[PDB]
Amino acid sequence: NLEKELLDNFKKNITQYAKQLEISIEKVYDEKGSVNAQKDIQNLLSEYANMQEIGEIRFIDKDQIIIATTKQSNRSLINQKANDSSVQKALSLGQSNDHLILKDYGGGKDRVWVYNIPVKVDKKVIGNIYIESKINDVYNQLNNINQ
């Protein structure tokens, strides 16, 4: 059962980090209001994305506009619509969600775990944190030990 255990531990880890980012962003809104908070989002995103297991974090507003990213090579996405059904689901339901994707970042299609956590202020959704996490590091290690 080693595979399920390691994947669950990887996901649990990302989710506990992401929750604290969500709480952090919420506190900035509670303290500063929406106009001034929306400028402290980038630093939080970037601090969190330093973790080895996180590929990219985006913050997406209520209207599905990409506000910020931690990936400099994706600066062209800022102010575009996310056009992402999983993001729409989180925004509408106010619930987290997750799924696996294949994505080629330059080395061939890699397995990537996508987690969305909506950001709530006064119980209302204001946006969504979208995370691409490097779950292929788990699969790669399992293959290396023949499990």
Added chain:
Amino acid sequence: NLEKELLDNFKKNITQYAKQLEISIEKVYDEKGSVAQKDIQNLLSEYANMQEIGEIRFIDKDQIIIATTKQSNRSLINQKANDSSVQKALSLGQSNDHLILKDYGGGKDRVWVYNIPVKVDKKVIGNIYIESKINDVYNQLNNINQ
């Protein structure tokens, strides 16, 4: 207590890898020997490729260091471990852990030391000693101000 959760998560990961390595080593004893030894080195090496593991050593029941994953520590092979945590795992037949500070070249870093004994029949034949890079957790905690 993000901090306790994240530390716990790291340690569970290590402990679940280390349990499978113990099982694998035990298997190779059951069904070969030693002298199993090349197969033991390959197992240690595969396991040490994970990012969060610094070094793995396999120590026999007389406390001799039999194998390491770290090239620069080959001089340790055939020496006594002279390590009280290793002695504890051998004597008690249960895992143990503790934190150390160790300077690998970049200054003293927090390192999590985990020992799991290896048993054949139900008798201790050795011990797996692991140094793990728990300072990756503390570094990230400080980076997010938690």
